[PDB]
Design a binder for this molecule. Sequence first.
Ligand SMILES: Nc1nc2c(ncn2[C@@H]2O[C@H](COP(=O)(O)OP(=O)(O)O)[C@@H](O)[C@H]2O)c(=O)[nH]1
Ligand SMILES: [Mg+2]
Ligand SMILES: [Zn+2]
Lengths: 201, 38
Amino acid sequence: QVQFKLVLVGDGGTGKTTFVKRHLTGESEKKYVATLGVEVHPLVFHTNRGPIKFNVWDTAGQEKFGGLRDGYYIQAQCAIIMFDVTSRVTYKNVPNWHRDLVRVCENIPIVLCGNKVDIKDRKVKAKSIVFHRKKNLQYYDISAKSNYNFEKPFLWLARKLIGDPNLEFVAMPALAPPEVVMDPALAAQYEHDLEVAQTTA
Amino acid sequence: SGFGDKFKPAIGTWDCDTCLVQNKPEAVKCVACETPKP
Ligand SMILES: Nc1nc2c(ncn2[C@@H]2O[C@H](COP(=O)(O)OP(=O)(O)O)[C@@H](O)[C@H]2O)c(=O)[nH]1
Ligand SMILES: [Mg+2]
Ligand SMILES: [Zn+2]
């Protein structure tokens, strides 16, 4: 079975635990690592070429960048950097998390995720989200509490790790039902805003 | 159709049962979490 260690990093309170826990089987089969203060969630996705397992490392704590225990980053094969679109400080720390990550994990695929986009009073909008462009990374809006775009980071990483740009997920994993509403018109506007930001200098 | 031919580590490679990290055949404990190889 093909499995990949995915480190999920970002400021405390950005929604990392809420996000990973959406995957019900990854939550029921999670593994606690006492020496590193981490819960490892085994997240299976079913692709058109079979199952892929992301073993997602979610810190139990509220660590600053640079403050995770030695071992957390070892043998990571991919990563998600998360910030909170309602908190500008957490986006301004994205470069610090990226620096912390590549210090130990030299050349791994990384997705940048801006969480809590269900909250209407959004502070970090598409026009301000540029770090992924400067570092040639992929970015997605997500809402952990509504499952909005849950599969997007994993599909992007799966394609990079398997070397197959046409890889697809044949079905969504069983997810905890949405706890908040993600307005479909808001999602469409945000997706449009990101496309416009990308197509201009 | 599968992607098995991309992942063929050395004989004796083993997975940590505590943190699921893949370890090398000569390792006697996990390189990430220090759990002993069973
Ligand atoms: N409205 C909304 N709240 C969220 C979302 N994700 C997390 N929250 C909340 O943000 C707080 C911190 O979430 P948590 O998962 O503990 O963040 P962590 O410290 O990065 O693990 C919690 O009160 C969550 O309920 C989201 O997508 N939308
Ligand atoms: Mg947490
Ligand atoms: Zn281990």
